[PDB]
């Protein structure tokens, strides 16, 4: 029972014992695997009263009991080292709100776990056995504050934490000191997304991606996730989406697809908006609103027309939901964009239309702001036309070519450049059986 | 908190304040170097300002950022610049990194100097600061008092000065070891 | 620092040991491709 609970952890420690003698890939991925199966046993009734007794005994095990806080009494230096650390890993696991509610207790514990005899020698030894999420995933909760008077001061524990993560960013020595890292960024990112202005993300950019391989595509996507949101008000759209496009593409998430990928999708949906593309939410009908899309759809629904009021109405309606996702900042722009979009379409299809007939769409809307409004539109390209008011003729271009240009062959080049994608990758993985079969 | 107040402080006058700026800045560089990363040109100009003393602060400050920028010869150079803002026994991984990061750089130089001269190390061509700190780490290696540690360095450090002395000093004939420590190397 | 000096040092051999091979290959590549012909 607690036995079997312990027995599982015995296997974990037994697999920790694998890593203990130089064997992570087993251990970590097992620990990874263990992290999931961790939900099973969970709790910590006799698992720990039997753990703190099974392993060995250490001062910190005592200070850990301050987190335990209970009564058992009863009767009943090596193996009890990183196991204890690996259990401090599970300590954090005992903190999930699994076996906890207020980790603000555990906050200090975390430090008092993190900082002492830990966050010390571990550079290549601990391999992302740090979970700074599960470090912060704790603090994540409490950042429901509100309450804290943030934090302490303002809010320095987080500033500290940032600096502490910074204190890791040093510790990210790239000795392999990586994996967990840009969660730190991601934290800081979402910390920006909490308050700060990401743009130092550019510095965070400037450092790195979570290099590289063994990082969870999840994070690597979650990397992109915020990293998308960089370009959000960085107002790069593709790349933002490309992140999403590199995030949802192969980030592995079903359980976490649920609330969390919606988020992704939300901004993702928000992307094509940035481009005014309005894909068919005909899919985004599905696994969406419910709780995510449909305002986006309403947006799309509006953005299909981009009818400012009807547009605004959605916003008018969903602003809080927007506000809930802070996609509100968006769309304030695509308003006239779609207006200008329509302006472009089923309309520019003459080599003109007039001033006033194209002004008619503005005679539908406004006048001689047209001049601006058209220049407003022409300004961006995003249409191609000309005018002369001296002509009063809003002169709407071809947009007509052939592939005479290198334009296709650009794409061919684009295709060409990709010729190495799977081709060079085949060699990227050629190794593994081929090389391990030698073993 | 946030260094725009410090980036504020940067060009704001009163080298006193700017002293304070750097100092203050320096303590919080760790987080905000990112924010700070942009003012490095001024920071460089600061370090170019002999008028303002502490600018080695800025230099070392820049060094910190440079770590956080990955810039190291930059950092080392401005770690070199500090000497004061910097200390070896100041322990940051960054320090201990630039500590290391310095150490290496010596070798090739020394090697490239060993290339030309084999007494090169007896000479000035290498930044003394480095060579110093280098040997000061050798000291620390001497204080490590397992000198194979020092040796393989000084091996590539090419300083029999180091080696022979460390030997002779440590020659007590660890009877067979002072024989073997030789042999070991 | 040290036992690396023993240890670490030895692995550029491997670095080299790696290095050689592609060479052999490219030859061998060509080798087929020239041998491939009369076939």
């Amino acid at each position: 029972m607690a036995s079997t609970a312990v027995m599982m952890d015995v296997d974990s420690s037994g697999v920790n014992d694998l890593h203990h003698s130089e064997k992570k890939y087993a251990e970590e991925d097992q620990v990874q695997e263990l992290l999931k199966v961790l939900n099973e046993i969970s709790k910590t009734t006799l698992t720990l009263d039997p753990r703190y007794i099974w392993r060995s005994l250490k001062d910190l095990s005592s200070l850990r009991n301050q987190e335990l806080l209970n009564a058992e009494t009863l009767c009943f230096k090596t193996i009890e080292v990183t196991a204890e650390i690996n259990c401090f890993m599970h300590l954090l696991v005992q903190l999930f709100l699994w076996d906890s509610k207020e980790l603000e207790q555990l906050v200090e514990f975390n430090r008092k776990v993190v900082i002492p005899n830990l966050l010390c020698y571990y550079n290549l030894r601990s391999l992302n056995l740090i979970n700074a999420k599960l470090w912060f995933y704790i603090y994540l909760s409490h950042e429901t504050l509100a309450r804290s008077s943030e934090e302490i001061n303002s809010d320095n524990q987080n500033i500290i934490l940032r600096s502490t993560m910074m204190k890791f960013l040093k510790i990210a020595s790239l000795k392999h000191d990586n994996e967990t890292k840009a969660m730190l960024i991601n934290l800081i990112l979402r910390d920006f997304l909490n308050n700060g202005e990401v743009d130092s993300a550019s510095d965070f950019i400037s450092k790195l991606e979570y290099p590289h391989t063994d990082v969870s595509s999840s994070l690597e996507a979650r990397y992109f996730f915020y990293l998308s949101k960089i370009n959000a008000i960085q107002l790069d759209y593709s790349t933002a989406n490309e992140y999403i496009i590199a995030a949802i593409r192969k980030a592995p998430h079903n359980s976490k697809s649920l609330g969390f990928l919606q988020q992704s999708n939300k901004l993702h949906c928000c992307i094509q908006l940035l481009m005014g593309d309005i894909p068919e939410l005909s899919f985004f009908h599905q696994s969406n609103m419910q709780k995510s899309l449909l305002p986006y759809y309403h947006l799309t629904k509006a953005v299909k027309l981009g009818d400012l009021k009807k547009f605004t109405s959605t916003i008018t309606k969903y602003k809080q939901l927007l506000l809930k996702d802070d996609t509100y900042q968006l769309c304030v722009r695509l308003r006239s964009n779609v207006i200008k979009t329509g302006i472009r379409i089923i309309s520019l299809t003459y080599k003109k239309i007039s001033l006033r007939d194209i002004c008619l769409k503005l005679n539908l809307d406004s006048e001689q702001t047209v001049e601006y409004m058209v220049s407003r539109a022409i300004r961006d390209g995003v249409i191609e036309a000309k005018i002369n008011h001296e002509d009063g003729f809003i002169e709407t271009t071809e947009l007509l070519n052939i592939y005479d240009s290198e334009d296709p062959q650009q794409v061919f080049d684009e295709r060409i450049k990709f010729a190495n994608q799977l081709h060079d990758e085949y060699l990227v993985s050629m190794r593994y059986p081929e090389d391990k079969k030698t073993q | 908190t946030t260094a725009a107040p410090l980036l504020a402080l940067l060009r704001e006058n009163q080298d006193s304040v700017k002293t304070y700026a750097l100092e203050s800045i320096n303590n919080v560089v760790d987080q905000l170097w990112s924010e700070i990363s942009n003012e490095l040109p001024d920071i460089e100009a600061l370090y170019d300002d002999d008028t303002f003393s502490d600018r080695e602060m800025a230099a070392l400050i820049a060094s910190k950022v440079y770590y956080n920028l990955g810039e190291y010869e930059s950092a080392v150079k401005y770690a070199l610049a500090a000497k004061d803002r910097f200390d070896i026994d100041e322990k940051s991984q960054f320090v201990e990194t630039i500590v290391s990061k310095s150490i290496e750089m010596y070798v090739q130089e020394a090697s490239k100097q060993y290339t030309k001269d084999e007494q090169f190390y007896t000479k000035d061509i290498i930044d003394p600061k480095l060579t110093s700190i280098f040997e000061r780490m050798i000291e620390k290696c001497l204080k490590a008092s397992e000198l194979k540690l020092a040796l393989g360095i000084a091996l590539e450090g090419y300083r029999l000065d180091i080696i022979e002395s460390a030997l002779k000093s440590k020659l007590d004939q660890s009877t067979s070891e002072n024989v073997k420590i030789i042999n070991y190397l | 620092y040290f036992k690396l000096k023993k240890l670490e040092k030895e692995y550029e051999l491997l670095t080299l040991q790696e290095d050689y091979i592609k060479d052999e290959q490219r030859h061998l590549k060509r080798e087929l491709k020239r041998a491939q012909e009369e076939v």
Binding site: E434 | - | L4, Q17, I21, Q25
Partner: peptide
């Protein structure tokens, strides 16, 4: 120091495309 240390990891990591080309020489 640890400078010297993970320097291996490069070589350590290098070890491999090698062994592909090993398979390649074979494969050739």
């Amino acid at each position: 120091e640890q400078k010297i240390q993970e320097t291996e990891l490069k070589i350590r990591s290098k070890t491999e495309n090698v062994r592909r080309l090993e398979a390649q020489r074979n494969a050739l």
